Design a protein around this ligand. Structure first.
Ligand SMILES: Nc1ncnc2c1ncn2[C@@H]1O[C@H](COP(=O)(O)OP(=O)(O)OP(=O)(O)O)[C@@H](O)[C@H]1O
Ligand SMILES: [Mg+2]
Lengths: 253, 253, 63, 127, 63
């Protein structure tokens, strides 16, 4: 049927919002260095006052910034891309799938390398691929051996990786040093309740409205009305739960 | 659209609420995934379990007064009922001691009203189960909900469905608001219809309240409240327990 | 930009769900004749036990 | 073990005792599990408990027609002493002893002779 | 009667208590047709995570 292919489009957004909402909790840690999440777009303050780099921007599902909301002085920055295939959860992906993501990652990499030198960016920058399904092991081995400068056992997968990246030698190696693969995630039916279990640790009791409210916050960052500012900060999470800083320190010494 | 839903949903509840517009939207959204493709329907039970109540919460205390077939000719009652309607603007209390026929008369009174009239009958005694924790009958949040949904079932006004944490003044205002709608409906089709409220066994409720440590059963507040024009209120008790429900000086005995 | 045309796709679903949720309240009326809402597809019991008509089905937002 | 007067270890509220007994029958396969909710009143707990008594005895007597279900409350007076020591008046047993149970279940309590009137039996009770 | 439990429309506590009967059936059905995983068995930890509770929520006061 046709309606099946329309319904299967919504489950991907549900997976995306739940998985981002589980990440958003880390802003509450009092002795941790994370500072910002941006949903469907990089930070508008990424180059400070200077205009933003638009290359490879549309693969950005989630971006995470540590230390500063600005690539020139942040300690670490992550850009992440997600995939939720519904009906084939046990079946490994081929490299012809990861091609379409690797292309855009290299496109963003080139424009970032032009403005800031490699010896800085190689300490900061990561690209992640996150998916429900397992991923081809030999392709990962080729990625590893490229990143470590060893003769791989699978030259066809390395040739495919070269075709996808358009790079060879150590310039390929550096790029493969920034590429992270994370398969075999818990599916939607599990993700829907893991969030409840993790959110129950900050509260004094079990709760059943907080997993709704964090998801609603993440969803309302993904509309057109919030396009001027896609950021999430600690104050946003606290006013989503409905408290302010005085409730955490009601009676000072 | 995001706030019109709040305004329309606030009419069925006794107070303003800010979680119901989320929950109905979540219900509709979860009907639009693949997991519910076997059944895309929405029914009344789905909406009620989305709000978190069931049919027992709309009818928490049904009537139980025994009707009888034999009825000896007994001349006073036809005068005593017109004595009520011709002495409007004040609460009326009937009293007589044990086994004289108050509860039977409460079933007969309805036949003598002017045409077009409607009467609501409430039972505070049950069958001696009113003193048990699973069968209390004396709170506002039971009797007022009972009477509101009995009028709504007959087609006079909107339903009133309970919400946790709601105080006594909100239930009083929600009840008094719907009395006016019902009396407008009655006095459209006929000029002289009345709406009559009968509280049988009014003295048991205050005994049950005082036994568990409370002091204000619902009839102890309702008797001094002022009802809209065209509404009658009658209470029946034994003669020596009459001071528990403490009538105002303007009352009729 | 391209991302504008992706973001504008979500607002339509938000409008759809809010507008359907306003319709769903009418099921609570004690003296009204409405019996069912079906979201993105007609009722599977539309022809009783007989198989369902599939023509023109995908324009059905709400039934 | 003498902990029942410390704030983190109370045992005399409905939402502790009835949840314990319901899940102890449910773990054995006789009824659905009962899990608590914040903001629920005591009458809802009473009705939800009686429902699962009705489930359990119907499971049992379909295989042995003269079987019974026994519910035992040890140290019944201590629950009322702990309640009155902090300003309440109705521990769970003081309500449960006057409630009407389904057929095929029996209810037994144990106490010291000089403390018996704390839990105030009705005239039908057997001693 | 000796073997099958069924939901009535009444008696259950609101919210999380209502859907445990459905989620046990869902867990069993999910496990039977996810034989491609490392193992299809059910153990206590998966039951507790299916219900959403912790053991101390079921047993707040042991004997
Ligand atoms: N009109 C009647 N015709 C026949 N029998 C009647 C009539 N009214 C009362 N009785 C008899 O009197 C009995 C007592 O009636 P009823 O229960 O109404 O009394 P009551 O005054 O409400 O009692 P109580 O004060 O004890 O609550 C009835 O059960 C019935 O046997
Ligand atoms: Mg009587």
């Amino acid at each position: 049927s046709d309606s099946l292919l329309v319904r299967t489009s919504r489950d991907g957004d549900q997976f995306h919002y739940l998985w981002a909402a589980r990440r958003a909790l880390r802003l509450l840690e009092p002795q941790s260095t994370l500072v910002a999440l941006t949903i469907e777009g990089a930070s508008t303050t990424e180059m400070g006052s200077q205009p933003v780099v638009e290359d490879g921007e549309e693969l950005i599902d989630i971006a995470e910034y540590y230390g500063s909301n600005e690539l020139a002085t942040a300690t670490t920055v992550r850009y992440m891309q997600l995939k939720h295939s519904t009906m084939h959860s046990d079946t490994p992906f081929p490299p012809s799938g990861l091609q379409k993501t690797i292309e855009g990652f290299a496109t963003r990499y080139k424009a970032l390398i032009q403005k800031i030198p490699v010896e800085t960016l190689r300490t900061k920058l990561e690209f992640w691929f996150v998916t429900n399904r397992p991923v081809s092991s030999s392709f990962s081995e080729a990625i590893n051996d490229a990143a470590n400068q060893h003769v791989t056992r699978h030259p066809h997968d390395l040739a495919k990786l070269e075709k996808f990246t358009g790079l060879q030698g150590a310039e390929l190696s550096i790029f493969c040093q920034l590429l992270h693969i994370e398969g075999q995630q818990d599916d939607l039916w599990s993700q829907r309740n893991i969030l409840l279990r993790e959110s129950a640790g900050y509260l004094p009791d079990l709760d059943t409205e907080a997993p709704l409210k964090l998801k609603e916050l993440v969803n309302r960052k993904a509309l057109t009305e919030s396009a001027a500012n896609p950021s999430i900060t600690r104050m946003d999470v606290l006013r989503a739960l409905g408290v302010d800083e005085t409730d955490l320190f009601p009676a000072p010494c | 659209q995001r706030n019109i839903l709040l305004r329309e949903s606030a009419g069925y509840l006794p107070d303003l609420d800010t979680e119901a517009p989320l929950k109905l939207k979540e219900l509709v959204n979860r009907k639009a995934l693949t997991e519910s493709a076997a059944n895309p329907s929405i029914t009344r039970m789905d909406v009620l379990r989305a709000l978190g109540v069931d049919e027992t919460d709309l009818f928490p205390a049904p009537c139980r007064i025994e009707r009888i077939e034999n009825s000896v000719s007994r001349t006073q009652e036809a005068t005593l009922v017109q004595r009520v309607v011709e002495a409007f603007g004040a609460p009326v209390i009937i009293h007589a001691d044990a086994g004289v026929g108050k509860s039977i008369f409460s079933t007969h009174i309805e036949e003598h009203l002017p045409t077009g009239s409607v009467s609501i009958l409430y039972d505070c005694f049950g069958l001696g189960q009113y003193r048990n924790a699973s069968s209390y009958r004396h709170h506002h949040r039971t009797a007022l909900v009972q009477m509101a949904n009995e009028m709504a079932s007959r087609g006079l006004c909107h339903p009133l469905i309970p919400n946790a944490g709601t105080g006594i003044s909100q239930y009083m205002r929600a009840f008094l608001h719907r009395l006016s709608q019902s009396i407008s409906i009655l006095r459209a089709s006929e000029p002289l219809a009345v709406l009559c409220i009968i509280i049988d066994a009014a003295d048991n409720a205050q005994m049950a309240a005082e036994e568990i440590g409370e002091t204000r059963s619902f009839i102890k507040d309702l008797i001094r409240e002022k009802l809209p024009d065209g509404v009658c209120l009658v209470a029946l008790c034994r003669p020596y327990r009459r001071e528990l429900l403490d009538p105002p000086p303007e009352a009729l005995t």
